[PDB]
Design a protein around this ligand. Structure first.
Ligand SMILES: O=C1NCC[C@H]1N1Cc2ccc(Cl)cc2[C@H](C(=O)Nc2cncc3ccccc23)C1
Ligand SMILES: [Cl-]
Lengths: 298, 305
């Protein structure tokens, strides 16, 4: 029993964190094989013009108390790739994956190439992440673990004026309409991840919280007309199919649970909580719920 | 900016998790140097659990009855002893991944990271607090026994908890790494219940200071309170008494924000009376009590927004 916001064990990623310094700027790098990946802003910026003026010895890479020798450098989108002389002996089995809004991941927050904390979060529909970062955190990474393979999905680049965060996949493509420069940028209006709230309502039923269940059902179209009113993301037939396993386990059809969510949106919690929360939680995917309510290991 | 429930990086602890099997029971062990620590109830049957005589059950065991597995490698047990509710299995190999460590016993209100494990394999990490009633609100299934709680301030791992059991309300009970239980619990399937729980007042105050540091002040008021008047009000909402030690502990956050501890106590009294009125504090519609004053200073900036 119990339901916590749970992150993946961070050990495989900790063995990849390094400190990258260029001039007066220090940030974090990800050392995989003989390449160190980091935000290109470590160097109106014309990044190819700024990069051509740098030599390998301008980039100081530190792995623990050991200095790594940079033997090459190249840029791929908004990520800088520093070729080093030594392959990381702690390199795990890995993949670079781009995630979709609504998907969750673990973040290993780092300062000076040293991991300080791990938390779980979701890629918001507006492509920002509600993270917890201070100056020095740039280059910190987001990941998931599938079996023994670490899938890297995020690298931190910046904080927006509202306190939310923006970054790229490991190929340097930003999530959202952001650019890596000091300019006027704002996160768009955010929405609630509907399929994740439903998965979290199923997790509450599994843990014995059923006060919000009712005898009613709804059509998908009527639910989407109501959900569009409360800034909730539209629920697709794919989301319904994805919630199939949890529907079979609890005996509550996905549209039967949508009628519960509709009543919660129009009437509120009424002083009650669900899994210790007075708000509807949207940072647990259907897979996160099944994994935490089954004990899958890495 | 931002405020998340943050756990310590679990790598130093992952390299210590092993699987311990005794007969039909399998659970987790902590391998440090040449010793594997695990709940002593690994020697029990489900029948034995009502009134187990652990000393009588242990004397009947030999070293070869305990199967210890570290990854895909079988460890050789060369000795065994019991210390309170923990079983200590001496093994023939020292763990090469043993970090710098300490065994620390924590007090209620203290927070720590839990690395939940099944079959000696880590599955997840979360942050939690030792409740005033000595239970923890964890996320544990069958097979999680032996999973550990820890803090990693600097590069040293301080082990503070080992999971032993789930109570009827779904909350969890366990011991420090010397086998002493937190709370009035026993490793027996006898009728045991968690006492009525209360809110960790010093932690809610620390979290209100974290909100002020992150730029939120909607909940502040022009009032102050005496410590005694605050405690008379707080007791009525099932909040733990706030001691002078708690006031002293909140001194640094009071100096950083410019809000006296008893002035912050007046905002808290008002929040309890009024509720939030559709507003949130650090993305939460409830008053959060699982961030200590030390967690807030560690996570938050030194410059108030
Ligand atoms: O009555 C029981 N019901 C399930 C098995 C059994 N347990 C009695 C018991 C009594 C004393 C001691 Cl020290 C350990 C234990 C064990 C325990 O509680 N294990 C668990 C531990 N954590 C989270 C669980 C979730 C779900 C099932 C077990 C869980 C076993
Ligand atoms: Cl303590």
């Amino acid at each position: 029993s119990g339901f916590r916001k749970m992150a993946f064990p961070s050990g495989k990623v900790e063995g990849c964190m390094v400190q990258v310094t260029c001039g007066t700027t220090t940030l974090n790098g990800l050392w995989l094989d003989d390449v160190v990946y980091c935000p290109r802003h470590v160097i109106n910026p014309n990044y190819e013009d700024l990069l051509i003026r740098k030599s390998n010895h301008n980039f100081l890479v530190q792995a623990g108390n050991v200095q790594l020798r940079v033997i090459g450098h190249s840029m791929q989108n908004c990520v800088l790739k520093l070729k080093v002389d030594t392959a990381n002996p702690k390199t795990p089995k890995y993949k670079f994956v781009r995630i979709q809004p609504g998907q969750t991941f673990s973040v290993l927050a780092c300062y000076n190439g040293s991991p300080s904390g791990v938390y779980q979060c979701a890629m918001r529909p507006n492509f920002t992440i509600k993270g917890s970062f201070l100056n020095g955190s740039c280059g910190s990474v987001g990941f998931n673990i599938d079996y023994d393979c670490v899938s890297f999905c995020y690298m931190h680049h910046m904080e927006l004026p509202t306190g939310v965060h923006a970054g790229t996949d490991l190929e340097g493509n930003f999530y959202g309409p952001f650019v890596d420069r000091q300019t006027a940028q704002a996160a768009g209006t955010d929405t609630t991840i509907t399929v994740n709230v439903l998965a979290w309502l199923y997790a509450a039923v599994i843990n014995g919280d059923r006060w919000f269940l009712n005898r009613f059902t709804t059509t998908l179209n009527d639910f989407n007309l109501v959900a569009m009113k409360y800034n909730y993301e539209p629920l697709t037939q794919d989301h319904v199919d994805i919630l199939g396993p949890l529907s079979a386990q609890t005996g509550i059809a996905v549209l039967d649970m949508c009628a519960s969510l509709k009543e919660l949106l129009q009437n509120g919690m009424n002083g009650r909580t669900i899994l210790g929360s007075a708000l509807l939680e949207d940072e647990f995917t259907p897979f996160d719920v099944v994994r935490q309510c089954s004990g899958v290991t890495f």
